[PDB]
Design a protein around this ligand. Structure first.
Ligand SMILES: Cc1cn([C@H]2C[C@H](O)[C@@H](COP(=O)(O)OP(=O)(O)OP(=O)(O)O)O2)c(=O)[nH]c1=O
Ligand SMILES: Nc1nc2c(ncn2[C@H]2C[C@H](O)[C@@H](COP(=O)(O)OP(=O)(O)O)O2)c(=O)[nH]1
Ligand SMILES: Nc1nc2c(ncn2[C@H]2C[C@H](O)[C@@H](COP(=O)(O)OP(=O)(O)O)O2)c(=O)[nH]1
Ligand SMILES: [Mg+2]
Ligand SMILES: [Mg+2]
Ligand SMILES: [Mn+2]
Ligand SMILES: [Mn+2]
Ligand SMILES: [Mn+2]
Ligand SMILES: [Mn+2]
Lengths: 683, 289, 289, 683
C-alpha cells in the first residue's frame, strides 16, 4: 500500500468526531514527493526538454515555431511563478493519470501541470507572447479549464481531435444512412461522441419505392450504428460512445424506447448507443388533457408536404397531419408514453429528454433551422441542416452538422479573482482558436458547420463548491440569485467578446443577419429586466466587479447591431467529468452526488472529499439525492435563461421515488423552461 | 423481479453429454503420472458424489418448499440438469478414463474418506432439517445449497480446469466447464431466493442468520483446507487451490447478499485460462404547477 | 429393461415453445366466433392447471419414491417438461392470441370452476397421500398420474386437434402435438412402473387394486362428462368429445395393463387428421493419391 | 385440397410396384386448366396487352420501342408456335410462382411462359427482329436459360439488377471498410449476393497509427458486414446474403472460422455471412509434410514489403515472411487447421474452400491480378484489383470488383437439338448484352470492372439428367468422357464467339494483350491434345455435330491472336437453383440429391420426381449421397479443365463418414485440380 494511499485513507478515520480532512494535503504531498518527482523526467534546461519533446514525436513543431525560445521560456516562467499546488491527492492523481504527458511506454512523466498549461496556452495564443502569458495566468489560477480533448491534446503530435461532441443529421435514404455510419465511425475514431438524429428516417413498415412494408425503421439503423460504434472503439482505448435521437411523434418511438429495456431481445437491444427523446409542447399538451395522441410515419408526411416531419412545427401541423388521410398514423396514449419514459429512466437512466419548444422558443437561429436534437451529453442545442448524400458519381448536398468546442469557467476561482469579464473573454478567444484550428476531413457537414457557424461552448463548473464554501445552500433562493447574476454577466461578456471578434475580423457567422441578435429580439429581456442580485449577501459576493445593467445591455445591443456577432452559439454547460478533479471543483452546475467520494483505483481504494469540504460547511455540501429536484430544476432554469445552448441536467432520484415522481420532475422541468434532461440517477 | 430472466438463461444453456466426444482424452491421460491420475480420479468422484446429493435432495427439496409456479419450474429445470445431464456426464468421463474395477475402488475410497463425508453430510443434514412452512429452516438449507454450488465444488473443479488450461484432458475439461457454468447460475439463483427470505426478517433475526452463514462457512472452509491437502499435496498444488477456494467462498457470500470474508487474491493463471422502482400512473394535476 | 430407452426418447424429444412462431395463427384466431374462442381459452387453461400440478407435485413426488438413479432421472426430466415446457407453452399461446384482461379472466375462471377444482383435488390428494416405503399408496398415485396423462388431458386436447385437422390455428396446434407426443410416453412409462408394483401383489390384493383403478376412473369420468358439457355445448361438440375421452380412457387402462372398459366408437376424422461428425485425425497417407 | 396437388401426390402411391410418374402430367394439366388459365389476364390482342403493361409500370418502354409492333407480334407468334408444355407440375408451379409477372396486388397472372420468353428475347436482341426470334427459339426449346435475375427482370420497369453476384476487395483502412459496408448494402438492396475479400485487412492486435493491439481484426468487420446484410434484406423476402473470404495464412483465420461454430457467442458469431477460406498450395504442402505452419499479420507484411500479403505469392514468399524478423507471425498446426476446416464443414457446411493455386495455374489473366477469392456461390473466379477509397475531399483510386452475368445451357436439350455451337454463341451474345446494359452507379469498382473486363458466366445444367436419361452412370468413365467433349466444345464455341464479338466491335477486354489468350499459352492443351470422345457410346451422342479437332483449335488460336477476345472470362457453372425446375433439369452439373424430391409449400405437400425419371432409368438417377465423392471430384475436375472460372462444387456426405473422409475428399479435389468447393451437404 502506497504511503499517499494510506494517508488519503486516514480521512475516513474519524479523530475527535470529525474526518481528518487535513490528511489529503499530506496525501498529495506524499504522492508528489514519493512518486511524481521520482517519475518526472527532468532536463538541464527548458530548451533540451522542448527539443526532446518535438524530436521524439511528442509535440507539434508548427505551434512552437511561432515563438522565439525566449518567449516560450517566459511563458513557462509565468506558469511556474504561481507555484501551483494541488490541494487534494485526487486532483494530482487524476491529472498525472489522465492528462500528463507520458513516455511512449507510459513509464515516466514528461509534463507537469505547469508544462501542460504552458503548452496549452502557447497553442491558444498562436504566436502572441502576451496572450500566451494571459492564458497561462488564467489556467494556472484555474479560472478557466479547457475541455478534456483540448486540455489533453493541444500541442501534441499524436493527438486526437480537440472536439469530442458531434451531432449528425441522418436523411431518409440508404446513401445517407451509409454515410452516417461512415462519419460516425470516423468521428468515434477521433475519440468524439457522436449524436445522430433518426427522426427523418421513415418508420418500420414503410414503402421503399413502391414496395410497401419494406423498411426496418429506426431500429435497424440503430443496430447498424451500435455496431459501428462498437467497431470504432478509439483504437481499443476507450469504448465508442454514440447517441441516437428520435422525436416523440415518430412512429418508431415505442420501438426506439424498447431498445433500452432490460428484457430487450438481442436483435433489438443496443448496448453502446445512448437514446434521447425529443418532445414538442404538443405532446405535453396532449398528455396534460389525456387526449389520445398519434405518432406519424415520416415518409407519408414527406410525400404529402414535401418537408420532413421533424422539419415542421408540430404545434401547427399536428391537426393537419391527423386530419390528412394520406398521412399514416397510429393512436398512442401520451400519458402511457410518458409513464414508459419515466419507467425507462428509472431502470436505466435513458432516454435523454429534450423539450423541443423550450429550446426553440429562445433559440437565436431559428431562421437557419430549429433545434431538433442534442448531443451525447444533452447540452448542445444548435441549428442543423440535413445533408443529401447522393450516389457515388453525383455531387452531395452538404448541410450543417453540429460540433462545438467546450470550455469551463471555474465559478469559485473566477469569483474569488473578480475576473468574470476577463476570464469569459479569454475563454471565448481560446474556444474561437480551437474552432478555427479544427478541420475534420471525413465529416463534410461537420466541417462546413464549424467553418460557417463558428459555434463554441463556454460552460461553468464549481457552482455547488462555490456556494457551499460561501455558506449558501444550493436550493436556497440566494443560490439562484447568484446563478442569475453570474450567468447574466457571463452571457454579457461572451456576447461582447463575440461582437468584438466580429468587429476585429469584419465577419459574423453565416446567416447571422436573420438571427435574433441582428434584430435585437435577443436582448429584449436584458434591456427590459435588471439581473442584479436581489440579496445583500449575493450583492456582496460581486463586490469590486461591475454587474452589467440595463443601460450596459442596451449598449451591447447597439454594438451587436453595428458590428454583428461572431459565434452563433457561445455557452453550453457540459458535465465536465474528469477535469473537475484536476480543477478541485464540483462537476458542472450540478449539486454534488456525495460529500466524500469513495473510488477504487487498481487494487487500492481512494477517498475524495468534495473541494472545500470541512466541518463548518459540511451541511452546505448537501448531497444531490437528499435535495428537492424541484429546487434543482429552479436553479437550472435560472441558469438556462442566460445560456444560449442547453445544460447537462442530471436527475438525482431516491430509490423510494416512483414513476409518477420522475414524471412530475420532468413536467416541472418542462414548465420551468428546461431545455434538456440528461440522466436519471437513482440512489 | 428475476425468475423469468433466470428461466431464459437456464434453458438456453441446455446441453447433453453426447455432444462432447470423450475418447481423445486417452491421448493425454496416458502421459500423466500415477499421482496425477489418482488425484483426478478422487476429485472426480468427490464432485460426482456431491452432485448426486444435489440432484436427489438439494434441488428437489428446495423446489418443494418454495412458493411460486415459475420458481418451481426453474428449480425443476435445475434438478433435471443435475440428474439427467450432470450425473450422466460424470459417469461418461469415468467410463472413458478408468476400467470398471478401478471406478468401483475409487468410489469405495472416496465414500469412506473423512473430509468428503464431513462436508457431504453437513450439507445433507441441513436439507433434512427443512420444516414445512418454516422459512428460517428453508433459508438455512438455501445457504447450504449456495455453499455447495458456488464454493464446495471448486476445490474439485480446480484440477480439471488446471489440465484444461494446459491443453490436457480437453474433452472432459470442456464437459466440466459446462457443468461448472450450470452450478454458477444455480448458486446465483438459489442465492436470490435466500436473500428474499433474509429481507423479510427483523434486524435481530438478520444478525442471527448472518452468524449462522459465517459459522457454517467457517466449518466448511476448515474442512476444505484439510480436504485440499489430502488430495493436492501429492501433486504440489495445495497453496494455489486454497486461494481458489477463498475466491469462490467470496462469490458464494456475494450470492447470499453478504460481504466477502477473505481478502482478494490473484488466481493461478493456468486455471484462469481454463475458466424497476415503482410504476405509478399520472393522475392529473401533475401537469399543473 | 426399459428405463434407458425412455431416457433416450425423452431427452431426444426436448423442445421449447419459442421454437414455434405463433403470429401465423393471428388471423385464423381472429376469425373464430366468440363461443369458439371462449371454449379454446378455457380448454387450454384446464390443461395449464393439470400440467402445473403434474410438474409441481405429481412427477417430483413419484420421483422421490421410485428407486434407482436412472428411473429418477427420467421422472425428473418428465417433471421439468410439465412445468418448465408444457405449462409455459400455454402462456405463449395466450399472450399471442388474447389481450391481458381475457388472460386474467380465464385464470380466475380455473380457480372457481368446480369440475377443474374437483379433478385437481382428487389427483393431487392421491399424490400427497403417498407414504414412504408404502408401495400401495405409490401405486394409487401412479394410477392417478396415468389417468391425468392418458385420459384427463384429452377433453382439452380435442379442440386444438379439431382445429389443426381443418388447417386452423396450426402453430398453436404444433405446440399441442408436441405436448401430446410427450404425454403419450409419460403415460406409458408411469404405467410400466405401476404394473411393477401391481405384479408384486397377491391375487386378492390385485383384485382390490383393479377395483380402486376402475372406481377412480369412473369417478373421474363422471366429472369429466360434466366438464366436457360445460365447455363444449356452446360450440356443439360435447358428444364428439365424450367419444374421444372414452377412447383415451381405454388407452390409460391399457397403459396400466388392464382390459379396455368402454366400447369402441367412431372418432371425428378431423381430429384423426389433427394427429457433430466424428473427428478422425489425418494420416500421412491421406495426402497422397 | 387443390386437385393438381392431389394428382401430384398420386406419384408416390405405388401401383403394381411402381411409382405413378404419369400423374405429374395430369397434375400439371389440372394445375393449368384449374388455376393458371383462370388466373391469367387475357387481352383481346397483344397490342392491348403490351399497352396495358407499359402504361401501368410493368414493362420498360425503351426496349420495346426499338421494334415495330409487327416485329413484336412476330416474336410472340414464334414463342407460341412451339406450343411449349411444362412436363411436370413443379416446373409450371415454380415458373408461375417465382418468375411469371403478376398484377400489382399479386392477384392475377399477366405473363405466360411464352410472354416472359418473348420479352426476354426482345430485351436481348436490342432492336433486331431476327435475333429476337433466335433467342425465342433458344429459350422456348429450353436450350439456354438466363439466370434468375435476368430471366426475372428482363424488360420489367420496377426491377432489380440483372446481375446478382458481386465480389468486393476491401483495403486495410477505415475509409475502405466504410465504403465496403456501403457498397454491400447498395448491392444487397439491388438483390445481389455480395462476396468480400477480408485478407488485406490487418489481423487482431495490430497497430492503428503507432498504437498497438488496437485493431479488432477481420471479425469486427465481419460483424459490421453481417449487420449491413441484415439491414439490406429487401423486405426480408430474400434476406441480404453475403460471403466473406480469408486467406488461410491470415492470422485471424482461427477467429474467422470460429464465427461459424455452433458454440460461438453472440458477440462473435455471424449468421447472414457465409465464409470462404482461400488455401494456397503452400498450406497443403505444409500440412502434407506435417511441418509447423505460420499465419501472418498482414499489416507487418505490408509495412515490410509494400504489398499486401494476398497480393504476393505465398509459395515463394512464405519462407521470406518466416525468416523476416519485422514480419509478425503466429505458429499454427496446418493439419489441425485442416481438421478444424473439415469439422466446421461437417457441422455447418462452412467455409467454402478455394484452392488458390488450382485457380491461378490455369488463370488466363494473372497479369491483371491473381484470383484471391470467390463469390457467394463459390464459382466466380476472376482477377480483382483493390480500390483505395480516400477521405471525402480526396479522389478515390477505383480498382476492379468482380461481377459476371450468369446463364446456363441445358445439356439435355442442347444435345437433343445438336446445337452446341448455336446455343453457346447466342447465349454469349445475350450475356454480353446483359453486361453492356448493366450500370451500377453506387459500386464504382463493380461498374469499372464490368466496363473493362466484360466478363460473363455461361454455365450448364441437366448433366446428370442427360446422362441418366441416356443410360450413363454419373461416376462412370463414359460420363466423364461426355463431359470432357461437351465442355471442350462449349469452350471452343465460347472462345470463337468472344473473338468474333471482339472483331465486330473492334475492341477487346482491358489488358487483353497480357492474357494467355493473346500469348497463345491458353490454347496449348487444345492444340496438343484431342478431346474427341474415347468411347463409341459417347461418340454416337455427338453424331451429327462437329467436334473441333486439334486443327480447329489451332485455327481458333490464330483467330484469337489476330482479333483478340472480348470477354476476360466466359464460362462459370453456377448452382442454378430455382431455374432448374422451370427448365425441368437437374441442378447444375452436380448429381441429384433425391430421385423424387418432396417439398412443402405453405400447407401443401408436393413431390418432384427428377426430370425423365422412370423405371428404365431409376438406377441411373443415383443420388449424390450414395456415390463416391472421389468420382464426383473426377467429373468436376474433368469439366473444370474447360471452364475458365470455377464450378459450384457441393460435397454430398453421409452421416457415417468422419472428418477424415471430408479432409480426404478436399485433398483429392485439390490434387485433381478442383478450384473451389462450395458446400459440405450431409444427409
Ligand atoms: C479506425 C479503426 C481502424 N481499425 C483497423 C481497420 C483497418 O483495416 C485498419 C486501418 O485503419 P486506418 O483507417 O487505415 O487507420 P490509419 O490510417 O490512421 O492507421 P494506419 O496509419 O496504420 O494506416 O485499422 C480498427 O480495427 N478499429 C478502428 O477503430
Ligand atoms: N530546467 C528545466 N526547466 C523546466 C523543465 N520543464 C519545465 N521547465 C520550466 C522551469 C522554468 O520556469 C523554465 C525555464 O527553465 P530553465 O531552462 O532551467 O531556465 P533558467 O532558470 O536556467 O533560466 O522552464 C525541465 O525539465 N527542466
Ligand atoms: N390476343 C392475345 N395474344 C396474346 C396475349 N399474350 C400473348 N399473346 C400472343 C399470342 C399470339 O402468338 C400473339 C398475337 O396475338 P393477337 O394479338 O391476338 O393476334 P392475332 O391472333 O390476331 O394474330 O400474341 C394476350 O393477352 N392476348
Ligand atoms: Mg430516397
Ligand atoms: Mg490507413
Ligand atoms: Mn450438477
Ligand atoms: Mn447445481
Ligand atoms: Mn404435460
Ligand atoms: Mn406428462
Amino acid at each position: 500500500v502506497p504511503k499517499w494511499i494510506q494517508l488519503n485513507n486516514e480521512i475516513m478515520i474519524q479523530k475527535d468526531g470529525k474526518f481528518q480532512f487535513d490528511k489529503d494535503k499530506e496525501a498529495v504531498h506524499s504522492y508528489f514527493v514519493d512518486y511524481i518527482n521520482q517519475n518526472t523526467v527532468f532536463f538541464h534546461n527548458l530548451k533540451e526538454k522542448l527539443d526532446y519533446l518535438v524530436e521524439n514525436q511528442y509535440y507539434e513543431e508548427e505551434f512552437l515555431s511561432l515563438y522565439s525560445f525566449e518567449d516560450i521560456k517566459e511563458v513557462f516562467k509565468t506558469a511556474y511563478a504561481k507555484k501551483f499546488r494541488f490541494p487534494s491527492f485526487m486532483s494530482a492523481f487524476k491529472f498525472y493519470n489522465d492528462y500528463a504527458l507520458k513516455t511512449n511506454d507510459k513509464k515516466k512523466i514528461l509534463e507537469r501541470y505547469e508544462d501542460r498549461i504552458s503548452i496549452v496556452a502557447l497553442f491558444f495564443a498562436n504566436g502572441d507572447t502576451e496572450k500566451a502569458k494571459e492564458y497561462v495566468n488564467l489556467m494556472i489560477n484555474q479560472e478557466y479549464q479547457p475541455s478534456t480533448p483540448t486540455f489533453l491534446n493541444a500541442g501534441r503530435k499524436r493527438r486526437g481531435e480537440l472536439v469530442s461532441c458531434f451531432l449528425l443529421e441522418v436523411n431518409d435514404s440508404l446513401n445517407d444512412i451509409s454515410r452516417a455510419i461512415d462519419i460516425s465511425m470516423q468521428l468515434s475514431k477521433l475519440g468524439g461522441g457522436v449524436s445522430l438524429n433518426l427522426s427523418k428516417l421513415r418508420a418500420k413498415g414503410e414503402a421503399i419505392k413502391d414496395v410497401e412494408n419494406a423498411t426496418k425503421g429506426v431500429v435497424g439503423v440503430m443496430k447498424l450504428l451500435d455496431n459501428a460504434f462498437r467497431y470504432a472503439d478509439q483504437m481499443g482505448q476507450r469504448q465508442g460512445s454514440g447517441a441516437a435521437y428520435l422525436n416523440i411523434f415518430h412512429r418508431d418511438i415505442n420501438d426506439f424506447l424498447d431498445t433500452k429495456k432490460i428484457s430487450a431481445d438481442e436483435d433489438v437491444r443496443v448496448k453502446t448507443l445512448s437514446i434521447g427523446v425529443v418532445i414538442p409542447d404538443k405532446f405535453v399538451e396532449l398528455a396534460r388533457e389525456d387526449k389520445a395522441a398519434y405518432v406519424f410515419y415520416p415518409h407519408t408526411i414527406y410525400k404529402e408536404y414535401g418537408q420532413h416531419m421533424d422539419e415542421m412545427d408540430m404545434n401547427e401541423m399536428y391537426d393537419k397531419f391527423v386530419d390528412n388521410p394520406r398521412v399514416k398514423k397510429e393512436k398512442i396514449n401520451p400519458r402511457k408514453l410518458l409513464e414508459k419514459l419515466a419507467m425507462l429512466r428509472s431502470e436505466s437512466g435513458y432516454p435523454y429528454i429534450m423539450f423541443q419548444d423550450n429550446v426553440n422558443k429562445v433559440h437565436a437561429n431559428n431562421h437557419i433551422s430549429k433545434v431538433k436534437f442534442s448531443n451525447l451529453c444533452s447540452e448542445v442545442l444548435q441549428a442543423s441542416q440535413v445533408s443529401s448524400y447522393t450516389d457515388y458519381d453525383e455531387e452531395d448536398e452538404i448541410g450543417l452538422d453540429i460540433s462545438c468546442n467546450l470550455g469551463s469557467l471555474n465559478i469559485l476561482n473566477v469569483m474569488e479573482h473578480k475576473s468574470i469579464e476577463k476570464t469569459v473573454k479569454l475563454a471565448t478567444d481560446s474556444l474561437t482558436h480551437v474552432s478555427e484550428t479544427t478541420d475534420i476531413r471525413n465529416a463534410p457537414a461537420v466541417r462546413r458547420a464549424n467553418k460557417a457557424m463558428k459555434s463554441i461552448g463556454l460552460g461553468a463548473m464549481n457552482l455547488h463548491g462555490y456556494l457551499a464554501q460561501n455558506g449558501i445552500a444550493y436550493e436556497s433562493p440566494e443560490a439562484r440569485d447568484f446563478a442569475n447574476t453570474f450567468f447574466m454577466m457571463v452571457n454579457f461578456y461572451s456576447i461582447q467578446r463575440s461582437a468584438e471578434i466580429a468587429k476585429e475580423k469584419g465577419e459574423t457567422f453565416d446567416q447571422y443577419e436573420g438571427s435574433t441578435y441582428a434584430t435585437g429580439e435577443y436582448f429584449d429581456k436584458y434591456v427590459s429586466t435588471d439581473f442584479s442580485p436581489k440579496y445583500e449577501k449575493i450583492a456582496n459576493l460581486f463586490e469590486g466587479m461591475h454587474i452589467p445593467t440595463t443601460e450596459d445591455w442596451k449598449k451591447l445591443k447597439a454594438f451587436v447591431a453595428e458590428h454583428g456577432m461572431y459565434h452563433s452559439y457561445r455557452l453550453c454547460i457540459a458535465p465536465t467529468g474528469s477535469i473537475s478533479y484536476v480543477q478541485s471543483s464540483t462537476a458542472s452546475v450540478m449539486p454534488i452526488m456525495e460529500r466524500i467520494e469513495e473510488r477504487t483505483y487498481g487494487n487500492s481504494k481512494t477517498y475524495y472529499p468534495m473541494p472545500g469540504l470541512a466541518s463548518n460547511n459540511w451541511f452546505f455540501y448537501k448531497e444531490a439525492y437528499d435535495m428537492d429536484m424541484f429546487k434543482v430544476v429552479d436553479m437550472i432554469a435560472t441558469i438556462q435563461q442566460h445560456i444560449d445552448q442547453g445544460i447537462s441536467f442530471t436527475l438525482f432520484l431516491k430509490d423510494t421515488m416512483t414513476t409518477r415522481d420522475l414524471n412530475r420532475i420532468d413536467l416541472y422541468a418542462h414548465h420551468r423552461g428546461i431545455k434538456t434532461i440528461y440522466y436519471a440517477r437513482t440512489k | 423481479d428475476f425468475t423469468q430472466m433466470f428461466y431464459n438463461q437456464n434453458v438456453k444453456q441446455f446441453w447433453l453429454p453426447e455432444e462432447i466426444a470423450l475418447n481423445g482424452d486417452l491421448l493425454t491421460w496416458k502421459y500423466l503420472g500415477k499421482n496425477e491420475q489418482d488425484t483426478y480420479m478422487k476429485v472426480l468422484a468427490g464432485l460426482t458424489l456431491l452432485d448426486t446429493e444435489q440432484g436427489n435432495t438439494g434441488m428437489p427439496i428446495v423446489a418443494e418448499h418454495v412458493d411460486g409456479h415459475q420458481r418451481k419450474a426453474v428449480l425443476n429445470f435445475m434438478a433435471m440438469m443435475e440428474n439427467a445431464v450432470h450425473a450422466k456426464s460424470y459417469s461418461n468421463i469415468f467410463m472413458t478414463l478408468a476400467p470398471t474395477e478401478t471406478i468401483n475402488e475409487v468410489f469405495e475410497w472416496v465414500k469412506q474418506n473423512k473430509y468428503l463425508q464431513k462436508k457431504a453430510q453437513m450439507i445433507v443434514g441441513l436439507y433434512k432439517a427443512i420444516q414445512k412452512d418454516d422459512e428460517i429452516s428453508l433459508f438455512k438449507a438455501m445457504v447450504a445449497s449456495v455453499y455447495l454450488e458456488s464454493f464446495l465444488f471448486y476445490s474439485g473443479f480446480y484440477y480439471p480446469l488446471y489440465f484444461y488450461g494446459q491443453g490436457k484432458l480437453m474433452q472432459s475439461g470442456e464437459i466440466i466447464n459446462l457443468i461448472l457454468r450450470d452450478e454458477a447460475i444455480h448458486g446465483v439463483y438459489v442465492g436470490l431466493l435466500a436473500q428474499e427470505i433474509y429481507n423479510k426478517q427483523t434486524e435481530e433475526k438478520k444478525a442471527e442468520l448472518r452468524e449462522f452463514a459465517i459459522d457454517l462457512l467457517n466449518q466448511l472452509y476448515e474442512n476444505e483446507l484439510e480436504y485440499t491437502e489430502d488430495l493436492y499435496d501429492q501433486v504440489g498444488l495445495s497453496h494455489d487451490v486454497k486461494k481458489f477456494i477463498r475466491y469462490n467462498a467470496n462469490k458464494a457470500l456475494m450470492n447470499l447478499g453478504f460481504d466477502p470474508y477473505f481478502e482478494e487474491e490473484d488466481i493461478n493463471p493456468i486455471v484462469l485460462n481454463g475458466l424497476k422502482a415503482t410504476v405509478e400512473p399520472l393522475k392529473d394535476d401533475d401537469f399543473y404547477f
